[PDB]
Enzyme design. Structure first.
Site, short mmCIF file in Angstrom:
data_model
loop_
_atom_site.label_atom_id
_atom_site.label_comp_id
_atom_site.label_asym_id
_atom_site.label_seq_id
_atom_site.Cartn_x
_atom_site.Cartn_y
_atom_site.Cartn_z
CG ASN A 1 -3.83 7.88 -4.64
OD1 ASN A 1 -3.52 7.72 -3.46
ND2 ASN A 1 -4.28 9.04 -5.10
CB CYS B 1 -2.26 7.59 2.47
SG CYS B 1 -1.28 8.77 3.44
CG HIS C 1 -1.59 11.12 -0.51
ND1 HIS C 1 -2.60 10.69 0.31
CD2 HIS C 1 -1.66 10.37 -1.63
CE1 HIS C 1 -3.27 9.72 -0.29
NE2 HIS C 1 -2.72 9.50 -1.47
CD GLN D 1 -6.34 6.92 2.16
OE1 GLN D 1 -5.39 6.80 1.38
NE2 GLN D 1 -6.35 7.84 3.12
#
Ligand SMILES: *[C@@H]1O[C@H](CO)[C@@H](O[C@@H]2O[C@H](CO)[C@@H](O)[C@H](O)[C@H]2NC(C)=O)[C@H](O[C@H]2O[C@@H](C)[C@@H](O)[C@@H](O)[C@@H]2O)[C@H]1NC(C)=O
Ligand SMILES: *[C@@H]1O[C@H](CO)[C@@H](O[C@@H]2O[C@H](CO)[C@@H](O)[C@H](O)[C@H]2NC(C)=O)[C@H](O)[C@H]1NC(C)=O
Length: 216
Positions: A179, A25, A159, A19
């Protein structure tokens, strides 16, 4: 429920993305979940556009944050989401380009996973990758390199990530979480957070705000 599952091995996950310096995110978590359900339902694994979500999810704040559900809603409203290639990631707020709009993947709806229940989350993950929020503001989480994360972290939803599976190692259960900080972070972009812990909120509050896209 299977003892373990890895949607990456099942071919429903595209390579880890980054990102960058953009707080998107939530967009990456949404895309990962959609990419997963589409492959599971159609067999075609297509990388989708996070930028389109960043530019078009009016209820969210682009690079300044947002939630996954509003993003899922946009995809539903738009009749689909563009591919990563036709609407590439810029890592910054932009105008929702209607000129380039060309959805390749669509969803019918989206649902929330009953919270405060790792068993419920496991049932959902066993069917498809699940979008979740976790507390990744702490040093332990951010400095994670490998193994099952048992470090210190709270439950704040600051997150967004995507659970792509779960398993066990050294008699310890874990979640396989994708992630969006690049392949250089954690285990090639992934973090195996401990599963089935004491707190009902799950590790770093993983069971607090989990949802997934629905595609008939
Ligand atoms: C996330 O942080 C909160 C603080 O906002 C932690 O709660 C505080 O924890 C102290 C002890 O460290 C306790 O004396 C306070 O009563 C508590 N404050 C509030 C408003 O709850 C919280 O830690 C949790 O740890 C458990 C063992 C227990 O002490 C519980 O009361 C406490 O909330 C952190 N939450 C999680 C899920 O890790
Ligand atoms: C939206 O996307 C379109 C397509 O990528 C952009 O417009 C094209 O821009 C090129 C280069 O400037 C022009 O040669 C084309 O004529 C444009 N397309 C058309 C159909 O005329 C546009 O710049 C992007 N940004 C916005 C805000 O729309």
């Amino acid at each position: 429920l299977p003892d373990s599952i890895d949607w990456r091995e099942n071919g429903a996950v595209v390579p880890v993305k980054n990102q960058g310096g953009c707080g998107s995110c939530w967009a990456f978590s949404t895309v990962a979940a959609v990419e997963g359900i589409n492959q599971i339902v159609t067999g075609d694994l297509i990388s989708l556009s996070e930028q389109q979500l960043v530019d078009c999810t009016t209820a969210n704040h682009g690079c300044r944050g947002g939630w996954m559900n509003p993003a899922f809603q946009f995809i539903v409203n738009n009749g689909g989401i563009n591919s990563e290639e036709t609407y590439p990631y810029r890592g910054q707020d932009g105008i929702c380009n209607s000129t380039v709009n060309a959805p390749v993947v669509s969803i019918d709806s989206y649902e929330n996973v009953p919270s405060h229940n790792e068993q419920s989350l496991q049932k959902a993950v066993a069917n498809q990758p699940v979008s979740v929020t976790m507390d990744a503001a702490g040093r332990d989480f951010q400095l994670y390199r490998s193994g099952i994360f048992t470090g210190s972290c709270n439950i704040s939803a600051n997150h967004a990530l995507t659970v792509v599976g779960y398993g066990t190692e050294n008699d310890k259960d874990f979640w396989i979480v994708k992630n969006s900080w690049g392949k250089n972070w954690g285990e090639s972009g992934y973090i195996r957070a401990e599963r089935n812990i004491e707190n009902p909120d799950g590790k770093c509050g993983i069971t607090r705000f989990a949802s997934y896209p629905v595609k008939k």
